[PDB]
């Protein structure tokens, strides 16, 4: 029928501020860089939407990274992401201010959030997009991979507002912070509080005291079923330490007990774009490759010269990772010294 239909008076492009330890995650800044170009193309403003327990100096950083406007909705209930709290706050602000488009980083939580909002407002949502463009009138052209990346689709939300999408992280470049930019902070008071129906009973940091997470590591040293045993992962830790990188693995590695889920790379785990990905005893299933095929360089170490992973590896060695790794790590260490 008519819910979510455009009024014609909608304006501005909004970027959702996903935050951790109070600070925006980097995909926020990625989207502010891209959406700055889109907002300039259609002569509309770029807004950052900050739902938090404590804004700190974050609106200032958002302005320096391209935002003209920063909407802030602050409450203690917003300390941690929750579907019920954030969907409510985000939808009250859409209703109040009437944006043209909304852009959400396709993180685990963004992928939870986006479709809740879209269904609540009754509007269109394009998922985990990789290419974006805009017409002078503000109509956003959403392009995205589908079918495991085998098909690209270009999609429009012509009549419903706001036009929504989630956007793949690590795709778009942020702008360098500009101290000379100016913007406007708008403090939004919640009209209706909600009770969160979803209680968190365990919330544990996956990365330890000062250690490296695969998520942001410049090098990833990853092991599969071909590592043979959990203890042999110490080889990958040694290589990571020599490089200043982090250790990852395949879903098969998780299943065999070699590593815990937070180090899993692939479509059901993390997608990483390190400078080097060392794929050690990993066949290169399509589900794994989904998570690491945009690594700058892939180095494959595998006993099977027909391992699919070789298909996409600029460099590699056919052989036993258990003999090759410690020679490789030593040789790299020697080069890096003195």
């Amino acid at each position: 029928n008519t819910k979510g239909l455009k009024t014609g008076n909608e304006k501005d492009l909004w970027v959702y501020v996903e935050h951790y330890k109070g600070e925006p995650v980097h995909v926020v800044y990625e989207l502010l860089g891209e959406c700055r170009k889109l907002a300039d193309k259609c002569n509309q403003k770029l807004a950052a939407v900050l739902i938090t327990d404590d804004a700190k100096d974050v609106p200032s950083k958002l302005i320096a990274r391209g935002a003209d406007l920063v909407y802030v909705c602050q409450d203690p209930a917003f300390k941690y992401y929750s579907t019920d709290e954030y969907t409510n706050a985000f939808c009250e602000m859409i209703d109040e201010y009437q944006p043209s488009s909304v852009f959400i980083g396709a993180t685990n939580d963004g992928r939870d959030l986006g479709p809740r909002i879209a269904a609540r407002v009754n509007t269109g949502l394009c998922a985990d997009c990789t290419i974006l463009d805009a017409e002078e009138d503000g109509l956003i052209e959403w392009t995205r991979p589908a079918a495991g990346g085998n098909i690209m689709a270009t999609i429009l939300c012509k009549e419903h507002r706001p036009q929504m999408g989630t956007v793949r992280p690590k795709t778009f470049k942020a702008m360098e912070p500009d101290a000379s930019r100016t913007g406007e902070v708008i403090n939004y008071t919640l009209k209706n509080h909600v009770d969160d129906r979803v209680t968190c009973i365990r919330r544990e940091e996956v990365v330890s005291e000062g250690e490296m997470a695969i998520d942001d590591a410049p090098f990833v040293c990853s092991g599969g079923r071909g590592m043979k045993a959990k203890e042999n992962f110490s080889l990958l830790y040694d290589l990571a330490h020599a490089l200043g990188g982090a250790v990852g693995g395949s879903r098969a590695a998780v299943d065999e007990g070699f590593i815990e889920h937070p180090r899993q790379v692939g479509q059901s785990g993390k997608t990483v774009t390190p400078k080097i990905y060392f794929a050690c005893g990993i066949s290169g299933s399509v589900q794994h490759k989904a998570g690491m095929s945009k690594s700058d360089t892939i180095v494959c170490i595998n006993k099977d010269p027909d391992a699919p992973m070789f298909e996409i590896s600029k460099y590699g060695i056919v052989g036993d990772a258990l003999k090759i790794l410690p020679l490789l790590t030593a040789k790299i260490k020697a080069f890096k010294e003195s």
């Binding site: 992401y81 939870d112 079918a147 495991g148 690209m152 429009l156 889920h261 400078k275 010269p305």
Partner: protein
């Protein structure tokens, strides 16, 4: 307890390959399957049936030939199957698909737990389960790694990029599933009992779902164009010397010369 599993028949997109030489899409071994994340959702429902005695209904919105997926569900021990099939539902985006599914579920009475896959491997949107949950006013947890029931609560393990978490919610609720053990085997007997089952087929008119909320008519989004992306062929330097020390020397001197490894 009553459980509904939302299942989707998909082409097996894991079998698709773009040849980097020709930039053409090769479809060798691509058949219609049960969406793998839906096999995880179903196996999770089945595990709860084994443990607690739950009644399990599987529902899909698909063309006639999607019936085979429902049969596969019954063959592994789902109790009931429903096929929502009508050209009026075709052309649906995720809003239109979730509207159809949410209205179907409501018509038969909202169960204690609705399980979805995390995503379907064709569309790859991961939107339908949360949109269903919103349409039905229910709480959600997406991308479950484990699901358990304790009294009147569902206990769900879910991660994000920084945190490993466990959440609880009261029934009725919606969970989308990232992983479970592989769906159990369907025996010959299982498949025969499934073949003999009645699977009702529901039109939009039968369910009194308005035409303007479903299919293309109910879709805010429209795919305007699709194309095979270009894939740049990689011409790897792969060393296969007998002596791993030799292979490693060659590899490292190349990584050095090509500015991959620095001091």
């Amino acid at each position: 307890m009553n459980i509904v599993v939302c299942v989707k028949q998909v082409p097996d997109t894991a079998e698709m390959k773009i040849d980097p030489v020709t930039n053409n899409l090769v479809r060798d071994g691509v058949t219609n399957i049960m969406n793998p994340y839906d096999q995880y959702a179903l196996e999770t429902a089945l595990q709860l049936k084994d443990e607690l005695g739950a009644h399990v209904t599987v529902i899909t919105m698909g063309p006639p030939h999607a019936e085979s997926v429902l049969r596969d569900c019954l063959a592994v021990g789902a109790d009931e199957a429903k096929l929502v099939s009508d050209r009026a539902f075709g052309g649906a985006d995720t809003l239109a698909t979730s509207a159809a599914m949410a209205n179907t579920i409501k018509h038969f009475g909202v169960p204690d737990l609705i399980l979805c896959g995390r995503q379907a491997i064709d569309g790859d949107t991961a939107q339908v389960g949360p949109e269903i949950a919103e349409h039905l006013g229910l709480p959600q947890v997406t991308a479950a790694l484990k699901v358990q029931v304790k009294d009147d609560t569902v206990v769900v393990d879910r991660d994000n990029e920084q945190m490993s978490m466990t959440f609880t919610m009261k029934m009725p609720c919606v969970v989308t599933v990232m992983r479970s053990k592989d769906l159990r085997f369907a025996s010959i007997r299982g498949k025969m009992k499934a073949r003999k089952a009645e699977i009702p087929v529901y039109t939009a008119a039968a369910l009194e779902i308005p035409l303007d909320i479903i299919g293309k008519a109910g879709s805010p989004t429209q795919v305007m164009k699709s194309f095979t992306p270009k894939v740049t062929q990689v011409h790897g330097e792969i060393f296969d010397d007998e002596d791993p020390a030799v292979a490693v020397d060659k590899l490292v001197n190349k990584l050095i010369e090509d500015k991959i490894i620095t001091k």
